């Protein structure tokens, strides 16, 4: 927009929220029943993500078959219209996608009981329709909810949350404008525990300030698990 | 035995009926035995900037440049950027053969001193807008400078053996038949080439060579 106040002395951010308030979290299950085994339409703030789980199924070619566990493939498709300016495909932009996809595979292959499904493959197709900051955390929430819809056995929830640090004030669920003005940490918290399955720090953060950011990060991620858990309760009781 | 046809695909094939929507500055269709080589030469133009220390107007820096400058003989010569396409009934990216031939043609054209850099300069013009003569172009120190860039594409058909010698001999014929279209500027003002007027490429016949294995 323009020159804005990031965190006013009145404790209000540029979009009206406060330091510990999340963006609106509207999740949906079973949005694509005739196109995948697991579906989750993730709408976190202005982020709009479609996650499709196809599996466990027989691999198309025996060159990708494991006789002791399933193979996990995560495909992240960032649409040309996810932002304001219609971005053109860049050769450099392909490297950042591979790092995200690999980080997601290594994250959920440890939490999803792949041993129960041997000689099978689990394809995760993701389509990002719009992004507005905190896209990495929202991708995690879509995968967790889509795997549960597909009946894939997991050990616990994996909650994705993004925390920013402005001067000395940490801020929960950073949007696009806030990420452009501060350092951002994304976390992958496992269930109600304080254990992390993902930790990405892509900007400079003082070492003495990192301890507190993680505490508020894992805390706000528990709230994300509640929002995802409640959506599964309402969808199971009404059906 | 070889049989060639120069300027067959060129924009300047007919001196009277010069093609309007053509691009090829000169071509050659060679055939030795049963192999077929088709070689056309398009071209572009690039604007060069004066990054010389002469423009500093300082005697000390200029004298230091003249003392420390080392001689670079091949720096005064340019080369063509060829694109070889040997049709062997396959799909995919560039074959190792196509890439090696392109590099050899570039390295041999550059070392044999066929195209000096001063021979690819652009005698820049300025087309005017005199009264109801619509436009009029004039030709000759000017500020902005330009240089011709030559692109060549080679298509080898019915390959029966090593075709590097055939690609080189076909390129040496097409080079001896290219004309540089005269360029001018209007009076945000990019450069424009002439529709019909052109100057043949001044290639020294001393340095032209032919291949045989």
């Amino acid at each position: 927009m323009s020159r804005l106040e990031i965190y006013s002395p009145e404790g209000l951010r540029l979009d009206g929220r406060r330091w510990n308030e999340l963006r609106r979290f509207e999740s949906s299950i079973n949005t694509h029943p005739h196109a995948a085994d697991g579906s989750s339409y993730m709408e976190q703030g202005n982020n709009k993500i479609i996650t499709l789980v196809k599996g466990p199924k027989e691999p198309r070619l025996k060159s990708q078959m494991d006789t002791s566990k399933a193979l996990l493939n995560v495909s992240v498709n960032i649409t040309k219209f996810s932002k304001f300016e219609r971005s053109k495909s860049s050769h450099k932009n392909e490297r950042r996608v591979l790092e995200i996809q690999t980080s997601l595979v290594r994250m959920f292959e440890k939490n999803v009981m792949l041993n129960i499904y041997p000689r099978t493959v689990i394809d995760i197709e993701i389509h990002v329709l719009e992004q507005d900051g905190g896209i990495m955390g929202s991708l995690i929430n879509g995968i967790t909810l889509a795997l549960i819809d597909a009946g894939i056995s997991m050990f616990d929830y994996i909650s994705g949350i993004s925390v920013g640090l402005y001067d000395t004030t940490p801020l929960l669920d950073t949007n696009s404008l806030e990420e452009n003005a501060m350092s951002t940490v994304t976390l992958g918290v496992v269930g109600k525990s304080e254990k992390l399955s993902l930790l990405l720090v892509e900007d400079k953060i003082p070492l003495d300030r990192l301890e507190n950011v993680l505490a508020i990060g894992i805390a706000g991620a528990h709230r994300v698990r509640d929002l995802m858990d409640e959506e599964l309760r309402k969808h199971a009781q009404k059906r | 035995d070889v049989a060639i046809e120069n300027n067959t695909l060129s924009r300047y094939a007919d001196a009277g009926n010069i093609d309007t929507k053509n691009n090829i500055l000169g071509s050659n269709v060679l055939k030795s035995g049963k192999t077929i080589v088709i070689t056309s030469i398009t071209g572009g133009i690039i604007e060069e900037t004066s990054a010389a220390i002469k423009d500093l107007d300082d005697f000390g820096e200029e004298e230091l440049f003249e003392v420390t400058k080392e001689e670079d003989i091949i720096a005064n010569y340019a080369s063509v950027y060829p694109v070889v396409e040997v049709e062997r009934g396959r799909v995919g990216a560039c074959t190792d053969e196509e890439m090696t031939i392109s590099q050899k043609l570039h390295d041999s054209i550059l070392h044999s001193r066929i195209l000096p850099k001063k021979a690819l300069k652009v005698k820049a013009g300025v087309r005017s807008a005199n009264e109801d003569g619509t436009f009029s172009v004039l030709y000759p120190k000017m500020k902005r400078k330009w240089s011709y860039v030559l692109y060549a594409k080679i298509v080898v058909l019915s390959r029966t053996g090593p075709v590097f010698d055939l690609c080189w001999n076909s390129l040496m014929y097409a080079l001896q038949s290219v004309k540089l279209p005269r360029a001018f500027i209007d009076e945000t003002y990019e450069i424009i080439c002439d529709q019909t007027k052109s100057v043949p490429l001044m290639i020294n016949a001393k340095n032209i060579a032919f291949a045989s294995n």
Binding site: - | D72, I73, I74, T100
Partner: protein, 221 residues
């Protein structure tokens, strides 16, 4: 004078490092190992030649550098006593020692000398020995010079890469493996540098034989 080392890399069968003027090339050899389906040869050994530039990615310039380096090492290896096997020869150019946009002979010559030494360290059956030197002639005084500097290349009329094959104590020149010439020269200059090069390569193998013997002898018993 040239510098060379052997057995520098751990996770390969044979390695080497060849230095001349400012050109530095590290080469590694691994073989015989299991070849790929698109690589195996029914009767003889398959070669995988890879040369990588000091700057940027591997362009088509290194592709013709592979093809020339391949034409030298292929007759230099007893391929038939390794049927359905693979040999990976990888040359890494640390410093080019010359203008990459203009010349590539000082890197080709060092890759040949580095590959031969690495093939010796690996234990591949070699039919003979090999030496390679760069040759140039100066414009003003048409003088033939062996192992020219980077500045002499920019003042030369033609550049040459001579790769010879040595047998019997490094005295009998069995054949001329590679003679790559580019520039301006006639028949008289060719045999003038070819005769001059045959005696400069002859003292190179004599120095190479001393280099590899000073390293392999402490290994054996």
């Amino acid at each position: 004078s040239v510098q060379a080392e052997i057995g520098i890399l751990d996770h390969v069968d044979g390695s080497s490092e060849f230095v001349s003027q400012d050109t530095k090339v590290i080469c590694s050899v691994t073989g015989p190992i299991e070849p790929k389906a698109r690589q195996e040869l029914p009767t003889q050994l398959a070669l995988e030649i890879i040369v990588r530039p000091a700057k940027g990615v591997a362009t088509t310039r290194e592709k013709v550098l592979e093809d020339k380096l391949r034409a030298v090492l292929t007759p230099l290896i007893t391929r038939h006593c390794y049927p359905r096997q693979l040999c990976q020869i990888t040359c890494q150019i640390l410093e080019s020692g010359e203008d990459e946009a203009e010349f590539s002979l000082r890197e080709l010559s060092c890759c040949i000398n580095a590959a031969f030494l690495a093939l010796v360290d690996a234990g591949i059956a070699l039919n003979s020995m090999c030496a390679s030197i760069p040759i140039a002639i100066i414009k003003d005084t048409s003088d033939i010079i062996v192992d020219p500097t980077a500045e002499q290349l920019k003042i030369s009329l033609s550049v040459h890469t001579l790769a010879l094959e040595f047998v019997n104590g490094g005295k009998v020149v069995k054949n001329v493996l590679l003679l790559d010439s580019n520039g301006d020269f006639n028949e008289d200059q060719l045999f003038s540098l070819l005769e001059l090069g045959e005696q400069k390569c002859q003292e190179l193998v004599t120095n190479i034989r001393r280099i590899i013997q000073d390293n392999i002898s402490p290994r054996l018993v």
